Amino acid sequence: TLSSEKKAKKVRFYRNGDRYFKGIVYAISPDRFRSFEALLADLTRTLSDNVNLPQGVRTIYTIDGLKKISSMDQLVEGESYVCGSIEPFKKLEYTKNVNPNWSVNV
């Protein structure tokens, strides 16, 4: 630590079309991910594999699939988002049975 996790914005990212992966928590702050393109690049590093988002993360959706994120301030503390690549948004119950404590005790 150089800064507290309690002061960082924690959000959870899922993979479009992937029902079984239950997401990854990212801490976003003035010292962490300072740019949108650094966030997308890291999401590719962590989430993109040979069968999941293989071309790379291109899009971040709200959990309903109805909005594509364009700025970091649209990411809301404790909310969940879905990373997409080439296939359109797939509506799954991504957050089902995922306990919210990842956003509380950090």
UniProtKB/Swiss-Prot annotation:
Leader peptide range in chain numbering: none
Superkingdom per UniProt: Eukaryota
Tissue expression remark: In fetal tissues, highly expressed in brain, detectable in lung and liver, but not in kidney. In adult tissues, expressed ubiquitously in the brain, detectable in the heart, liver, spleen, thymus, prostate, testis, ovary, small intestine and colon. The type A isoforms seem to be expressed predominantly in fetal brain whereas type B isoforms are expressed abundantly in both fetal and adult brain.
Every Doublecortin domain range: 9-95
Induction: Up-regulated in response to enterovirus 71 (EV71) infection (at protein level).
Entry function: Probable kinase that may be involved in a calcium-signaling pathway controlling neuronal migration in the developing brain. May also participate in functions of the mature nervous system.
Family: Belongs to the protein kinase superfamily. CAMK Ser/Thr protein kinase family. CaMK subfamily.
Protein name in the entry: Serine/threonine-protein kinase DCLK1
Species of origin: Homo sapiens
Parent-record interval covered: 49 to 154 of 740
